[PDB]
Ligand binder design. Structure first.
Ligand SMILES: CCCCCCCCCCCCCCCCCC(=O)OC[C@H](COP(=O)([O-])OCC(O)COP(=O)([O-])OC[C@@H](COC(=O)CCCCCCCCCCCCCCCCC)OC(=O)CCCCCCCCCCCCCCCCC)OC(=O)CCCCCCCCCCCCCCCCC
Ligand SMILES: CCCCCCCCCCCCCCCCCC(=O)OC[C@H](COP(=O)(O)OCCN)OC(=O)CCCCCCCCCCCCCCCCC
Ligand SMILES: CCCCCCCCCCCCCCCCCC(=O)OC[C@H](COP(=O)(O)OCCN)OC(=O)CCCCCCCCCCCCCCCCC
Ligand SMILES: CCCCCCCCCCCCCCCCCC(=O)OC[C@H](COP(=O)(O)OCCN)OC(=O)CCCCCCCCCCCCCCCCC
Ligand SMILES: CCCCCCCCCCCC(=O)OC[C@H](COP(=O)(O)OCC[N+](C)(C)C)OC(=O)CCCCCCCCCCC
Ligand SMILES: CCCCCCCCCCCC(=O)OC[C@H](COP(=O)(O)OCC[N+](C)(C)C)OC(=O)CCCCCCCCCCC
Lengths: 486, 655, 198, 44, 91, 86, 125
């Protein structure tokens, strides 16, 4: 057979479906469920007894550009997975169909452009985890900006324009200093690959410099104090898939970037500059939580919580301990289950019904919208880290390791257990509480589409909250590769 | 196909979950009976298990699947019913079964009965998970989820605004304690590498006292929150905004006692941390005094009784600081029996009256109208006043005695503080009894025409709990307060054992004055309220202000909001505006925008006149050539001088 | 569902047949917002075209093989049925149900079934089962964690150094292996640290 | 006490969730039996 | 079962350019660390047995087991290969 | 019943709603009691093997062996007990 | 009354009305408002810091002014703890010694090793 004939069959079927029924979302949903299954098959065929990278394929080689390279000289972009990358891959295929299905009926102008852009962002994120060299990572790290800008500017809310320039300029700023560090790596080592980059022991004085450019970027993407001011706006004015994709995956890229670029190399700079990281993560936690206590827009509040949980996860991964790695990862997974549910509730339910996000209108949903109340409270108690939910198991483990590295900072950061409860329950009480708002008339309870989504995002986090050990089969190497202890 | 422990753990889970899934299909009737009957079956399992353990005392375990085995950290979902666990289960299971039967007659006419009964069984199941779990982690699960369930129960009337705010206060004090609890879990696992009771208690006699001090201080701060000692008793009185049965089950007998259970289970560690024992004692004396003073001068009914609960909890913490664990354990068991009964009688009172008021000042003389409710409340008050033969005498006087019988010299003062707490106990009890039954009426007339004893569903639980508050003490003082009991084998440090000295050193004066005073002041304040009522009605402006202090909980409720919460919200808004939306937009979008607005408007307003573009660009050539010739001249001779020339040039070009 | 159920004449007549009607978002309101404002034969006319929406008018082998000018007719004249069906479903709060025998469909109240969404067949039968497969696979790959391998290798290194235990009874080797583990070291970490030794 | 309109017990959510939960349970038990009879599970 | 028993390599005997040997040594160092952890866990289990069976006597019968656990805990734990792969102690 | 007031009927909750008492509940109550009893039995029979008494499982001779080996490891590694360093 | 925080925001209001805040908890409950629960009429202007001055905000107390409240709280606490210290100088002596135990303070059964008796040895005998 011909590879070209199979994809020509697919493209032909896609053209006919586009021409008969003038819509794509059925084909994209099919492709999304197909990718999920194919990734599951890769997990079936993935050996957990090997720290090596599997399913390697190289692209854009000199000899066979539009195919795959079997050469003895590799000058192209590399790809392949370890168990770390497979974890977030499973998170991304799991979310993409839901990010399309959270917008199945509310997009009515230029719909096919929207579902194209969503799938392109989701596929680009997926391939970023397969990346095995600094340059392929970077060119798939920066490829979401044009699509996010376009998506937000067209299908956004009132203040879409300001949000779109913010997601672009901030992320581009941090990315460019990442490019400088990568370029210094590339003119020194003369090789960029995530296979043998830990062997090369650069001088300390140069690790102290490369680290600054990598960390400037990761401050801007994660985000972290004091570059935490783009996230609330970009979430507030984005379409629902933009918010779900962002909070679920793009903020997890910063964590994958640390583990894959910054720790196996630059070890000595990590163990020297870790206390400055603890300063920054701690300020991120408390100040963003307290800033959340006095906000008015619903979607902005969920956004601030995302900054806090990422800042806890940075305490753990940057702690030089196994439990820190396994917690910071599980935070990223459970966060990418919980936060999309909340952004769905506050961005594709309430905003669809009443077209406003101010808390002052909302009150007394429990009377006419009870099922929405039940989901709000469950997700609120999972967000804050009620046990038997991954957002606790990850909080606890990261605070174990943060306490080990610096006990004072790792214990003064335990107040996140409180402050998360404050800024989330002050809101949940308002929504589920009181007499029905006079400003709001009645509308339907949650429909089955949204109930499907929230029940998936809750079953997944309850599972990893009940038996987190399932994820260890992929990560038992990764908890020890990135530990610099003599 | 029998398992006491499996059935104890699954049946409540059935009764919590099945109604939530099947309530619209089953109706509030069958749900009330199914949850009642299943929680009845559970109570029988525990009483029979209690018998067997008295016969043998080899606890059963239940080792289930692994939650986390990563690296030097094995946490399984282990479960166990030991001696301390089976006592906490006796309180929980008995009180919850009574309440499930009492809340049928109390919650009729309420539309949302199903969710109410599901939550009661939810709390029961999660406390069962608390007392059972053979590791600190399984404890933390029950700790959090009972605070969650408390939020929902206190918020059971979702329209009532004040109920919601009290729910938020309760669950945020919960997390203010749970944060420190996680800090203790992180420290326990850094030190011992595990979280289970077996390893930690087999080793705690070898590890540095500073580490156990940090651990126990954090766990105690969590217990201070839940057990509602003086620093964090705010939530407790607010938690009465919910229905009465919730007050009977949670904030009377069970949820508050979770902190005492934590300390009793960690007693094997606490014996090597004298500092925390001393703090626990003195914080408890502060509680048991402030509560009584706040109770004698209150007019709400549920408030007084919940404050009585705060006092007995303070006295249990006193005993724990005197290193007599079995005594506080016994007072827990009694305190459940003679306090849930009070809250049930309070409900039958409140419903006999037409408007469901909670003010003794408008109750009067229901004695002839409500005799059965009266005999039950006075039983509990006497079991609270340590009348002879009742459980409270055994459970309470012995703690007042060990205060004198302790080897420490400075604990003598705590005897008097406990004794003042006692005479205050007889005060506020007899106050409720006079104001509610003996006094002249103070309502209208129709209230007395329609007062009526409540149905069978209300009485029978008060009957059984009355039997328990009459007989349980003499039936179980051979197990707990006995001489060499070995049932609750906590490894007491021999140096701290004083029960023999407690029972023998004590004289007549120090064995009679509590009992004498409990009778005498009780009868006295009755005589004053009935014959010389002016004494409580002087209308002096310096007495009435002190009444205003002891009302409003020693103004702490106003200290907390204004100085902590309000100065947290303002600081939070100071942050959100002045930083997140102030300087951090200035060092970013806003400031860079203004900076570029000017710099671009000064760059382009440089070739100023369009009148002749030629001479201007020509002069620009001459300036640039001259400037470069002179700049290179300066930077040949010295380069650290040309730099400011270039800063200023950039200013001239961009200002 | 069907294979070659397309028909040209029906669509080419249905085009002008729908064009003779007023626009969908104004048919059932009559520009005032009242369902009764429409006539009765008009109402049945609309309901009978709307029932046509959920009817098999094309098949797989017809979409793969026919040309653009016909598919375009299907597209632009099916969008109208979509709009009419759903505007009437919202406004009247009825659906059009042709009963078995009588060839006359009209709006009706029954909605307890017979209505499915276009996203169900994909998700409930391709996504969810794959998630369940993922759960099963994570569970049965957890058996390949290093903790069990390491326990098995420690027992074997002990039996190698100390073969004698094998002849002892079959429910005592566990405790004997425990004793021998607690005695000494069966790790070889200091054997990999060779230059560390001075 | 008053009555309300009749409601079926076996609503779809009960069927779905119960069948899936209990089906995964049945699979776990069957695979444990296969492991008892052989050296490996079926999914292995 | 087919219990694999791989080969033990060290960083001090390999050249860092032949990647297969480096991966072998990395996996070896990590596997031996996990084995040290399992030995610690078995000590913990025996300690809990000695406590649950003894009771008040644990102070004597479990003494050496408890000291052994508290001496092993700071050392028998994951500590990673990079700090030996990127540091020669002979200098 | 007593003390009632109107309520919307379309509002649907997994719980009752308002004064929920459908005219079939005897049958549904039978189904629920049957499932609950079967679940309780399945759980008890499943958890039986995973039970054990705290004691009686491990012989004291095994404990003495293990404590001996503990002393052996401690002296091979040349370690001293807590407090001796004084 | 305009508090500190609420008149430090004067330079920033621009065109917004500089309202004088009054918490709703003190507003007359017996008046008929549109939103009877929050005690707000429909087009009532809002202060910049209304999140502090609505009903969902923390409760105010109108009896004691907060400074006198702090005086009373701390004065009660200090009285209690100072009495509890002073009364340790007015304490009688114990009528009997602490118990003492046979085998050298039970150092063996407390986990001793003949050299750590200071750490583990209980009372002499
Ligand atoms: C990176 C790595 C990432 C790792 C990820 C790990 C993999 C993720 C796994 C995802 C699984 C997804 C499965 C799925 O797709 O379900 C879709 C689908 C979505 O739900 P849906 O019903 O279709 O939603 C539409 C509405 O029902 C339609 O609307 P409605 O009108 O019918 O409203 C009803 C709705 C409305 O009610 C509500 O809103 C209430 C709130 C819902 C909360 C639900 C959260 C889960 C609660 C569990 C409670 C258990 C407590 C203990 O309530 C419900 O649907 C919930 C019913 C409660 C259960 C029924 C009781 C029967 C017993 O759910 C299912 O079909 C069943 C899945 C159930 C699986 C649970 C797993 C249990 C395991 C068994 C334990 C023992 C063995 C375990 C070991 C197994 C080894 C082999
Ligand atoms: C890296 C390069 C960045 C790419 C950014 C994509 C920018 C697309 C924005 C402009 C646009 O409208 O996209 C064209 C799109 C079709 O646009 P559409 O909504 O369907 O309008 C009617 C079609 N004739 O056509 C597409 O489908 C393009 C989707 C990409
Ligand atoms: C200044 C920066 C602080 C940064 C670090 C964080 C410090 C702790 C957290 C304080 C920050 C401010 C919190 C503001 C949240 C307010 C949310 C809200 O609006 O709800 C109000 C609620 C009280 O509700 P309320 O109106 O009073 O209703 C009662 C009527 N039924 O409010 C509440 O219920 C209160 C919830 C917080 C409970 C905290 C209690 C602390 C008490 C400490 C006493 C000292 C104890 C000793 C501790 C030992 C430490 C070594
Ligand atoms: C060898 C040594 C050489 C090294 C370089 C040394 C740097 C010397 C820089 C001086 C050269 C002249 C450029 C000065 C900027 C020009 C405009 C200006 O004067 O700034 C004022 C501007 C005014 O703001 P405002 O008060 O609101 O408006 C009324 C002004 N009459 O201010 C503002 O808009 C508010 C400022 C807020 C702070 C923003 C901080 C942003 C920092 C990142 C800047 C990145 C962009 C750099 C632009 C380069 C332009 C030359
Ligand atoms: C541990 C994993 C999750 C366990 C499964 C829990 C979900 C089961 C479905 C509950 C449906 C329900 O409770 O109803 C939803 C209730 C309806 O109240 P109502 O009684 O029906 O009367 C109707 C009268 N209204 C209309 C006036 C209210 O909405 C609420 O008032 C908000 C309370 C939410 C209770 C949440 C249940 C406890 C779960 C908390 C665990 C984190
Ligand atoms: C820090 C990055 C940053 O602060 O970038 C944020 C700002 C974004 O400017 P803006 O407000 O969106 O421009 C307004 C555009 N409108 C009006 C069309 C929406 O970037 C800049 O001004 C330039 C970046 C300078 C990098 C140093």
């Amino acid at each position: 057979m011909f590879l070209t004939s199979i994809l020509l069959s697919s493209l032909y079927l896609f053209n006919r479906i586009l021409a008969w029924q003038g819509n794509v979302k059925h084909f994209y949903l099919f492709a999304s469920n197909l990718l999920l299954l194919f990734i599951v098959v890769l997990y079936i065929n993935f050996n957990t007894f090997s720290n090596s990278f599997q399913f390697n394929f190289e692209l854009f080689n000199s000899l066979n550009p539009f195919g795959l390279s079997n050469s003895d000289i590799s000058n192209g972009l590399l790809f392949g997975i370890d168990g770390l990358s497979l974890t977030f891959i499973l998170l991304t295929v799991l979310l993409i169909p839901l990010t399309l299905l959270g917008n199945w009926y509310n997009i009515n102008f230029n719909s096919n452009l929207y579902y194209t852009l969503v799938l392109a962002i989701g596929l680009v994120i997926l391939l970023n985890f397969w990346a095995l060299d600094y340059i392929s990572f970077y060119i798939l790290f920066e490829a979401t900006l044009p699509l996010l800008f376009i998506l937000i500017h067209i299908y956004g809310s009132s203040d879409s324009e300001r949000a779109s320039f913010y997601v672009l300029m901030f992320t581009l700023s941090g990315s460019l200093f990442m490019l400088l560090s990568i370029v210094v790596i590339s003119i020194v080592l003369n090789t960029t690959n995530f296979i043998n980059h830990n062997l090369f022991v650069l001088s300390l004085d140069l690790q102290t410099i490369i680290w600054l450019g990598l960390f400037i970027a990761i401050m801007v993407k994660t985000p972290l104090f004091p570059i935490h001011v783009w996230l609330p706006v970009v979430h507030s004015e984005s379409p629902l898939a933009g918010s779900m994709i962002l909070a679920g995956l793009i903020l997890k890229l910063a964590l994958y970037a640390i583990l894959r670029l910054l720790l196996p190399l630059l070890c000595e700079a990590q163990i020297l500059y870790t206390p400055m990281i603890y300063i920054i993560s701690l300020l991120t936690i408390i100040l963003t939580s307290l800033a959340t206590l006095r906000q008015i827009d619903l979607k902005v509040i969920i956004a601030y919580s995302s900054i806090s949980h990422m800042g806890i996860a940075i305490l753990g991964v940057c702690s030089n301990t196994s439990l820190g790695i396994y917690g910071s990862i599980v935070l990223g997974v459970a966060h990418g289950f919980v936060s999309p549910a909340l952004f769905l509730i506050v961005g594709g339910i309430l905003y669809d019904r009443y077209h406003i996000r101010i808390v002052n209108y909302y009150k007394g949903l429990t009377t006419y919208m009870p099922q929405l109340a039940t989901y709000i409270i469950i997700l609120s108690f999972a967000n804050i880290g009620t046990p038997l939910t991954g957002n606790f198991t990850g909080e606890f483990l990261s605070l174990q390791g943060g306490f080990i590295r610096n006990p004072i900072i790792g214990g003064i950061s335990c107040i996140s257990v409180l402050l998360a409860a404050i800024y989330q329950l002050k809101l949940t009480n308002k929504l589920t509480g009181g007499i029905s708002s006079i400003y709001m008339h009645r509308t339907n309870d949650v429909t089955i589409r949204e109930k499907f989504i929230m029940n998936i995002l809750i079953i997944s986090t309850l599972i990893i909250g009940i038996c987190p050990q399932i994820m260890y089969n992929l990560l038992y190497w990764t908890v020890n590769n990135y530990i610099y202890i003599i | 196909m029998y398992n006491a422990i499996s059935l104890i753990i699954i049946l409540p889970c059935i009764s919590w979950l099945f109604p939530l899934f099947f309530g619209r299909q089953l109706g509030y009737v069958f749900v009330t009976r199914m949850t009642s009957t299943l929680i009845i079956i559970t109570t029988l399992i525990t009483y029979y298990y209690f018998y067997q353990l008295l016969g043998n005392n080899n606890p059963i375990n239940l080792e289930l699947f692994n939650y986390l085995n990563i690296d030097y950290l094995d946490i399984n979902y282990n479960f166990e019913i030991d001696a301390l666990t089976i006592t906490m289960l006796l309180a929980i299971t008995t009180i919850s079964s009574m309440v499930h039967i009492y809340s049928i007659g109390y919650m009729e006419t309420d539309p949302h009965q199903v969710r109410f009964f599901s939550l009661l069984s939810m709390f029961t199941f999660w406390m069962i998970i608390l007392v059972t779990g053979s590791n600190y982690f399984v404890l933390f699960v029950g700790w959090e989820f009972i605070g969650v369930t408390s939020y929902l129960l206190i918020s059971f009337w979702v329209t009532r605004l004040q109920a919601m705010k009290s729910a938020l206060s309760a669950v945020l004090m919960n997390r203010f304690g749970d944060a420190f609890f996680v800090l203790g879990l992180c420290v326990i696992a850094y030190v011992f590498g595990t979280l289970n009771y077996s390893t930690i208690f087999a080793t705690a006699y070898l590890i540095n006292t500073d580490l156990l001090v940090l651990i126990m201080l954090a766990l105690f701060i969590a217990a201070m929150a839940k057990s509602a000692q003086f620093g964090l008793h705010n939530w407790l009185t607010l938690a009465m905004e919910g229905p009465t049965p919730v007050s009977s089950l949670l904030h009377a007998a069970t949820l508050v006692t979770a902190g005492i259970y934590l300390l009793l289970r960690s007693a094997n560690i606490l014996e090597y941390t004298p500092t925390v024992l001393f703090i626990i004692l003195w914080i408890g004396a502060l509680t048991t005094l402030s509560a009584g003073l706040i109770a004698i001068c209150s007019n709400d009914l549920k408030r007084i009784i919940a404050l009585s609960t705060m006092s007995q909890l303070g006295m249990m913490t006193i005993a724990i600081g005197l290193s007599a664990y079995n005594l506080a354990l016994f007072h827990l068991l009694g305190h459940a029996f003679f306090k849930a009964l009070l809250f049930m009688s309070a409900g039958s009172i409140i419903h006999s009256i037409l408007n469901e008021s909670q003010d003794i000042r408008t109750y009067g003389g229901l004695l002839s109208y409500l005799p059965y409710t009266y005999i039950c409340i006075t039983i509990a008050s006497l079991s609270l006043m340590a009348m002879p033969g009742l459980t409270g005498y055994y459970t309470k006087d012995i703690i007042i005695e060990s205060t004198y019988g302790s080897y420490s010299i400075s604990n003598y003062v705590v005897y008097w503080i406990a004794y003042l707490s006692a005479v205050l106990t007889c005060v506020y009890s007899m106050k409720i009894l006079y104001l509610t039954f003996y006094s002249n009426p103070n309502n209208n007339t129709i209230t007395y025409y329609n007062a009526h004893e409540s149905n069978i569903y209300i009485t029978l639980p008060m009957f059984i709990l009355a039997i328990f508050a009459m007989f349980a003490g003499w039936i179980l003082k051979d197990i707990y307060l006995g001489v060499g009991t070995d049932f609750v084998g906590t490894h007491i440090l021999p140096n701290n054992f004083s029960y023999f000295d407690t029972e023998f050193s004590i004289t007549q004066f120090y064995k009679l004055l509590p009992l004498i005073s409990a009778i005498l002041v009780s009868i006295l304040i009755v005589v004053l309220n009935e014959f010389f009522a002016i004494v409580f009605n002087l209308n002096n402006k310096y007495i009435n202000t002190v009444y205003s202090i002891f009302n409003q909980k020693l103004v702490s409720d106003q200290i907390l909001n204004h100085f902590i919460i309000f100065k947290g919200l303002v600081t939070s808004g100071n942050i959100a505006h002045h930083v997140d939306k102030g300087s951090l937009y200035r060092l970013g979008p806003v400031g860079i925008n203004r900076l570029l607005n000017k710099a671009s408007y000064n760059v382009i307003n440089l070739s100023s006149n369009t009148r002749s573009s030629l001479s201007m660009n020509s002069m620009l050539i001459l300036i640039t050539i001259v400037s470069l010739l002179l700049l290179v001249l300066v930077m040949n001779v010295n380069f650290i001088i040309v730099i400011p020339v270039l800063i200023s040039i950039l200013y001239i070009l961009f200002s | 569902f069907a294979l070659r159920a397309y028909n040209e004449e029906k669509e080419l007549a249905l085009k002008q047949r729908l064009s003779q009607l007023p626009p969908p978002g104004k048919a059932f309101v009559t520009a005032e917002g009242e369902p009764r404002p429409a006539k009765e034969a008009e109402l049945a006319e609309l309901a009978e075209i709307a029932a046509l929406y959920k009817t098999d008018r094309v098949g797989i082998l017809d979409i793969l093989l026919l040309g653009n000018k016909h598919a375009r007719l299907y597209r632009d004249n099916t969008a109208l049925l979509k709009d009419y069906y759903y505007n009437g479903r919202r406004i009247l709060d009825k659906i059009p149900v042709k009963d078995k025998q009588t060839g006359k469909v009209t709006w009706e109240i029954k909605r307890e079934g017979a209505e499915k969404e276009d996203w169900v067949n994909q998700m409930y039968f391709l996504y969810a089962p794959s998630l369940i497969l993922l759960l099963i696979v994570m569970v049965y790959k957890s058996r390949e964690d290093i903790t069990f391998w390491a326990k098995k290798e420690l027992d074997q290194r002990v039996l190698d150094k100390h073969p004698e235990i094998n002849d002892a009874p079959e429910n005592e080797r566990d405790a004997l292996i425990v004793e021998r583990i607690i005695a000494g070291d069966y790790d070889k970490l200091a054997s990999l640290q060779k230059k560390a030794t001075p | 006490p008053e009555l309300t309109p009749a409601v079926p017990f076996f609503q779809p959510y009960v069927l779905k969730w119960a069948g899936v939960s209990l089906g995964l349970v049945a699979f776990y038990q069957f695979n444990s039996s296969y492991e008892a009879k052989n050296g490996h599970t079926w999914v292995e | 079962s087919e219990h694999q028993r791989p080969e033990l390599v060290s960083f001090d005997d390999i050249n860092y350019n032949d990647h297969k040997k480096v991966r072998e040594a990395q996996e070896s160092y990590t596997r031996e660390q996990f084995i040290r952890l399992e030995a610690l866990k078995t000590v913990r289990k025996a300690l809990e047995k000695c406590y649950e069976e003894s009771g008040p006597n644990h102070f004597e019968d479990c003494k050496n087991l408890a000291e052994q656990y508290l001496d092993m805990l700071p050392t028998h734990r994951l500590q990673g290969y990079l700090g030996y792969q990127r540091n020669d102690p002979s200098k | 019943g007593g003390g009632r007031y109107p309520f919307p009927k379309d509002v649907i909750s997994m719980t009752g709603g308002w004064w929920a008492n459908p005219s079939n509940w005897k049958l549904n109550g039978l189904f629920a009691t049957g499932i609950a009893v079967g679940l309780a039995l399945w759980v008890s029979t499943a958890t039986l093997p995973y039970t054990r008494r705290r004691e009686g499982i491990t012989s004291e001779s095994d404990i003495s062996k293990w404590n001996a080996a503990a002393g052996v490891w401690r002296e091979r590694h040349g370690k001293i007990s807590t407090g001796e360093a004084a | 009354i305009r508090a500190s925080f609420d008149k430090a925001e004067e330079p920033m209001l621009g065109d917004y009305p500089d309202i004088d805040p009054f918490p709703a908890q003190l507003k007359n409950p017996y008046k008929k408002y549109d939103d009877q629960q929050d005690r707000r009429n429909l087009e009532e202007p809002l202060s910049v810091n209304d999140d502090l001055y609505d009903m969902w905000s923390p409760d105010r107390f109108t009896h004691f002014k907060n400074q006198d409240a702090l005086k009373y709280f701390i004065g009660f606490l200090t009285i209690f703890f100072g009495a509890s210290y002073v009364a340790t100088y007015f304490v009688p002596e114990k009528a009997a010694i602490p118990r003492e135990f046979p085998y050298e303070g039970l150092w063996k059964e407390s986990g001793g090793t003949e050299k750590s008796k200071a750490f583990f040895g209980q009372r002499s005998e």
